[PDB]
């Protein structure tokens, strides 16, 4: 995308989202990041929406194939699950490469740095969902380390109702439950996050209240599933 203007790539990413063309959206946003400038709040959301949708579809297909393969246990189901897995890993590696070159290192404000470190934890978590080899423990620890750094900044720099802080805690709680085999840590994190946000809702405008309560409901939905 090197020959297209940054502003045109952003415009086309927004069009691609409207047209439900998320692979295109992710390619446009990759091109925008590679221009080398920092991203605004709105642009960070376009980057996350694009890749979350692409990898979400891959994850769903991998789970369908993995279930068939496990019920089966010719080479075709395994081969095709491996093909989908390799493509998923390649998209995660691409996102992680954008974060490492050079989004995280140039992010100084708490909102941008927490956003990118949450993404880093998420894409290592997606790698961990399909990992089995000699690096699986290391992939899990890479997710944990990214989420932990994001948590440390968020607790120092953001109020307990901040939607980025809340979504980070939600996703790190999912990591604890589904990846790290730490359901008690998952439940504790979700409950403490929910309660501390509840106690800060009185400070918020109607529109901020709506955002914080939406994510608090996601925390509650998980606690209901886990308890």
């Amino acid at each position: 995308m090197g020959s297209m203007e940054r502003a045109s790539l952003i415009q086309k990413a927004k069009l691609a989202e409207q047209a439900e063309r998320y692979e295109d959206m992710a390619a446009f946003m990759k091109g925008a990041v590679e221009k080398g400038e920092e991203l605004s709040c709105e642009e960070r959301n376009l980057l996350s929406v694009a890749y979350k949708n692409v990898v979400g579809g891959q994850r769903a297909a991998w789970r369908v194939l993995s279930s068939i393969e496990q019920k089966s246990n010719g080479p075709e189901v395994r081969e095709y699950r491996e093909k989908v897995e390799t493509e998923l890993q390649g998209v995660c590696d691409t996102v992680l490469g954008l974060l490492d070159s050079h989004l995280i290192k140039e992010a100084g404000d708490a909102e941008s740095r927490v956003f990118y470190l949450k993404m880093k934890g998420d894409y290592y978590r997606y790698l961990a969902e399909v990992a089995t080899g000699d690096d699986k423990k290391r992939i899990i620890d890479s997710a944990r380390s990214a989420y932990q750094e994001a948590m440390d900044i968020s607790k120092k720099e953001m109020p307990p109702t901040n939607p980025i802080r809340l979504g980070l805690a939600l996703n790190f709680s999912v990591f604890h439950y589904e990846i790290a085999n730490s359901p008690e840590e998952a439940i504790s994190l979700a409950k403490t996050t929910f309660d501390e946000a509840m106690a800060d809702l009185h400070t918020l405008s109607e529109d901020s209240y709506k955002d914080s309560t939406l994510i608090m409901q996601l925390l509650r939905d998980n606690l209901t599933l886990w308890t």
Partner: peptide, 9 residues
């Protein structure tokens, strides 16, 4: 268990 969605919807 659900993680955060890309958009509010």
């Amino acid at each position: 268990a659900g993680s955060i969605p890309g958009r509010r919807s």
